[PDB]
Amino acid sequence: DDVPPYFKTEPVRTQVHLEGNRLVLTCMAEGSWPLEFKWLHNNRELTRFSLEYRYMITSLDRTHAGFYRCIVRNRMGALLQRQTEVQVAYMGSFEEGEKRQSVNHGEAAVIRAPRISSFPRPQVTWFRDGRKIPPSSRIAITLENTLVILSTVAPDAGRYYVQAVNDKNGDNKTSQPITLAVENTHEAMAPIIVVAPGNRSVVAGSSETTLECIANARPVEELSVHWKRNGVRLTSGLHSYGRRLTITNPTSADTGMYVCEATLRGSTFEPARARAFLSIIEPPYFTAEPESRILGEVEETMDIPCRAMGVPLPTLQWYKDAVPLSKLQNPRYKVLPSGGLHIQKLSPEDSGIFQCFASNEGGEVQTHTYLDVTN
Amino acid sequence: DDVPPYFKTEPVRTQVHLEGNRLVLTCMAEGSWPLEFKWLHNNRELTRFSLEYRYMITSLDRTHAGFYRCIVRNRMGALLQRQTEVQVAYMGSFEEGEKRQSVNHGEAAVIRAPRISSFPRPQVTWFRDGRKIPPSSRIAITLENTLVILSTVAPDAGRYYVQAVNDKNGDNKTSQPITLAVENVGGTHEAMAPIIVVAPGNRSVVAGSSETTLECIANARPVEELSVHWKRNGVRLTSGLHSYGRRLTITNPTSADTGMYVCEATLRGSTFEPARARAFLSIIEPPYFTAEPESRILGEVEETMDIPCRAMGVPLPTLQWYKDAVPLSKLQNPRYKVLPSGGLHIQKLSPEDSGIFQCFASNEGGEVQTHTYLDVTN
Ligand SMILES: *[C@@H]1O[C@H](CO)[C@@H](O[C@@H]2O[C@H](CO)[C@@H](O)[C@H](O)[C@H]2NC(C)=O)[C@H](O)[C@H]1NC(C)=O
Ligand SMILES: *[C@@H]1O[C@H](CO)[C@@H](O)[C@H](O)[C@H]1NC(C)=O
Ligand SMILES: *[C@@H]1O[C@H](CO)[C@@H](O)[C@H](O)[C@H]1NC(C)=O
Numbered sequence: 001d002d003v004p005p006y007f008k009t010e011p012v013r014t015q016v017h018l019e020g021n022r023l024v025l026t027c028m029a030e031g032s033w034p035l036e037f038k039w040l041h042n043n044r045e046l047t048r049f050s051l052e053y054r055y056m057i058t059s060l061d062r063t064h065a066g067f068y069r070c071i072v073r074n075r076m077g078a079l080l081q082r083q084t085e086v087q088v089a090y091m092g093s094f095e096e097g098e099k100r101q102s103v104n105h106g107e108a109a110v111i112r113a114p115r116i117s118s119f120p121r122p123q124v125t126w127f128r129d130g131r132k133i134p135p136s137s138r139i140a141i142t143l144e145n146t147l148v149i150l151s152t153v154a155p156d157a158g159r160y161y162v163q164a165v166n167d168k169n170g171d172n173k174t175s176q177p178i179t180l181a182v183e184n185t186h187e188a189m190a191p192i193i194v195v196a197p198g199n200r201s202v203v204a205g206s207s208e209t210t211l212e213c214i215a216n217a218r219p220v221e222e223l224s225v226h227w228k229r230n231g232v233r234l235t236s237g238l239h240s241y242g243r244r245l246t247i248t249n250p251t252s253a254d255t256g257m258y259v260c261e262a263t264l265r266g267s268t269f270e271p272a273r274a275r276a277f278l279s280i281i282e283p284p285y286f287t288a289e290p291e292s293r294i295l296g297e298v299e300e301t302m303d304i305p306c307r308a309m310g311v312p313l314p315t316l317q318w319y320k321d322a323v324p325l326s327k328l329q330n331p332r333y334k335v336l337p338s339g340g341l342h343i344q345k346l347s348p349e350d351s352g353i354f355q356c357f358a359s360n361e362g363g364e365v366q367t368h369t370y371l372d373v374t375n
Numbered sequence: 376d377d378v379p380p381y382f383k384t385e386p387v388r389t390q391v392h393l394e395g396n397r398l399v400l401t402c403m404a405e406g407s408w409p410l411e412f413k414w415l416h417n418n419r420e421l422t423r424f425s426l427e428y429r430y431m432i433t434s435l436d437r438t439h440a441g442f443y444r445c446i447v448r449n450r451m452g453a454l455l456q457r458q459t460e461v462q463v464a465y466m467g468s469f470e471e472g473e474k475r476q477s478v479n480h481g482e483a484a485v486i487r488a489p490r491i492s493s494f495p496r497p498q499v500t501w502f503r504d505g506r507k508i509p510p511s512s513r514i515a516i517t518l519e520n521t522l523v524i525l526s527t528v529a530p531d532a533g534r535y536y537v538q539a540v541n542d543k544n545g546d547n548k549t550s551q552p553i554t555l556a557v558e559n560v561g562g563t564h565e566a567m568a569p570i571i572v573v574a575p576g577n578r579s580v581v582a583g584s585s586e587t588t589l590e591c592i593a594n595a596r597p598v599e600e601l602s603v604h605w606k607r608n609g610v611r612l613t614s615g616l617h618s619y620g621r622r623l624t625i626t627n628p629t630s631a632d633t634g635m636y637v638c639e640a641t642l643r644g645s646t647f648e649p650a651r652a653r654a655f656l657s658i659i660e661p662p663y664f665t666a667e668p669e670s671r672i673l674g675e676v677e678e679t680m681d682i683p684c685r686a687m688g689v690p691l692p693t694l695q696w697y698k699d700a701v702p703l704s705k706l707q708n709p710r711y712k713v714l715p716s717g718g719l720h721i722q723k724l725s726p727e728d729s730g731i732f733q734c735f736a737s738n739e740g741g742e743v744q745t746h747t748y749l750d751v752t753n
């Protein structure tokens with residue numbers, strides 16, 4: 001008949017799978033028979049066209065991770081599926097050997113966790129001389145799993161190793177140890193920021209984002225780490241002895257400059273301060289779409305609308321029957337600065353599916369039309 | 376040491392998995408040595424406490440679907456994880472053989488999709504004699520994939536069957552046909568009263584979702600003059616309608632959209648009583664805390680302690696307290712009383728009262744939790 005390809009059911013944008021499990025992707029497309037399908041991984045063809053609407057992997061590997069989409073096609077045109085990100089849960093091995101490290105007495109000893117490839121990033125347990133060190137007033141484990149020993153004393157000399165656990169597959173790995181030496185001290189020590197918060201960008205609508213600030217001082221029991229936004233002492237979302245600030249449901253009211261302040265209570269020392277900036281990445285959305293079907297007349301000049309917004313400002317890109325217009329290099333097609341597609345001297349071969357994509361760092365959206373050219 | 380258990384990371388609320396794949400759940404707890412763990416499935420123990428922070432199913436079955444959570448424990452107290460819903464993707468076979476069905480000429484043929492169990496609910500396409508059946512003015516396909524042929528005629532008789540495709544494991548199935556017979560009766564010149572052949576049901580929807588849809592399909596003769604209209608509080612709705620007025624979609628519903636909706640079918644220019652059906656739409660606002668306790672609390676012996684916990688939501692969330700992963704109803708401690716606001720009220724504080732107090736607020740739309748560790752000193 002005369003039904004162009006469309007999708008009855010659309011894939012989830014992101015999905016996490018375990019290595020060794022089976023993955024079945026589906027091209028849930030409808031249209032006039034016969035329908036043909038082919039699959040793309042990271043925008044590279046995996047298969048030729050076929051009647052097979054599925055892409056199966058019996059046993060997933062780290063390497064299978066990335067972006068998947070199908071192309072459905074019949075005699076009327078071709079259409080890209082919304083892409084889906086397969087994220088494969090995996091844990092490599094620790095890639096570093098034994099290290100030796102020294103810190104001055106009273107100073108913070110910073111021991112980075114040895115490098116390890118893992119999705120997602122793992123949680124860690126640090127050990128001092130074979131014994132678990134939970135976080136405390138004097139022990140900080142950063143969001144990047146670094147062990148910060150504040151106000152180091154002689155007994156802090158020892159061996160430190162880290163055990164990492166992937167929370168999706170349960171793998172655990174054990175690092176090579178770090179030997180820490182402490183060098184020689186009764187005097188108080190002004191607050192210094194040892195791990196500063198960094199600038200942070202997060203996709204709009206997310207559940208939470210956490211800022212972290214770790215300071216040294218002595219006596220550490222009188223060290224006080226607090227967060228200010230616009231000079232306002234932040235009172236909720238605090239934990240980890242003041243070192244972590246969780247912003248829940250970050251919106252524009254939460255963007256901007258946060259400040260962490262470290263004071264040594266009761267002292268005349270100057271407080272230590274560090275700034276950090278939070279930005280919201282807003283995924284793209286269309287502010288204008290074409291009709292699903294457009295009738296055009298030969299020699300007529302056509303304008304197919306497509307407008308998008310997003311933060312950062314999205315890039316718009318057109319496809320005709322799953323071929324990008326840049327590749328077609330059709331001298332009668334022109335993309336306008338608003339995103340709309342301008343066709344002149346409309347011809348019968350212009351009929352087919354024109355599909356618009358808008359995307360930035362935060363996601364991708366698509367819309368499409370079938371153009372019919374008669375007479 | 377002196378670190379009570381808490382969770383470094385909390386599991387995803389819902390997760391889909393394929394039958395035959397490996398499931399690994401984790402109890403990502405922090406706390407002083409020694410941490411032990413145990414696991415629950417639909418609030419029933421699967422294991423005793425052990426050093427195993429993992430729960431693993433080598434090959435999933437449908438029956439492994441449900442809610443899972445761990446309890447973590449050290450010498451200081453015990454803490455309940457936020458629960459997760461494991462959904463198993465599968466598709467059974469069709470549970471019915473060949474069916475035969477009879478309608479009289481001009482009556483509506485309501486043909487249910489043949490029963491098949493599957494998660495998620497499959498994509499269902501209707502077919503007749505090798506050809507695909509599209510919705511039209513006369514042909515409706517309900518939200519439950521029921522096929523409705525309004526005002527049947529002789530060409531409507533035939534063999535109808537569905538293709539069901541599961542979009543998570545990609546398995547396809549084809550049912551055995553329903554053979555529809557159109558019987559002739561000697562009054563096809565006379566008009567038929569409007570009748571609702573597929574009624575709208577009650578519907579519950581979590582607030583703030585983008586849209587929920589009610590559906591009401593009616594028959595009459597001449598079906599040309601049939602009118603389906605939607606009314607709320609006696610006033611005919613003029614927007615939010617689609618699919619020839621058979622579908623009413625409420626977009627971003629709030630408490631203001633709760634209540635009863637009536638669909639009404641008339642035969643224009645007739646004096647027939649209109650067919651009416653009621654549907655009840657409930658907007659569920661999931662629970663959220665408006666008050667939470669401090670993460671750690673130091674009380675004096677003999678003190679009367681008020682631990683806060685307050686929640687808001689529609690319906691009003693019910694609050695339940697645990698001490699060290701034991702519900703207070705099982706403890707039956709006469710010094711523990713839960714205030715109507717939801718707060719926990721402890722009188723004559725005792726050294727054994729020390730531990731983790733965990734407050735749960737839940738309704739039909741979800742469950743939320745907060746907790747504290749209580750120290751009792753002299
Ligand atoms: C749809 O919901 C209404 C209420 O939300 C249900 O009707 C109630 O049924 C209980 C049962 O005893 C009665 O006590 C109430 O008085 C009824 N209320 C009303 C307004 O009728 C109704 O049964 C539900 N119907 C379906 C099909 O779920
Ligand atoms: C950690 O992994 C090793 C293999 O790398 C395994 O033998 C051991 O059982 C695991 N332990 C835990 C607590 O998961
Ligand atoms: C963080 O952002 C500010 C302004 O937005 C910039 O000046 C500063 O250099 C950034 N910090 C970095 C890049 O470390």
Ligand SMILES: C[As](C)(=O)[O-]
Pocket residue numbers: 014015016017389390391392
């Ligand atoms: C809901 As899933 C397929 O990311 O486990």
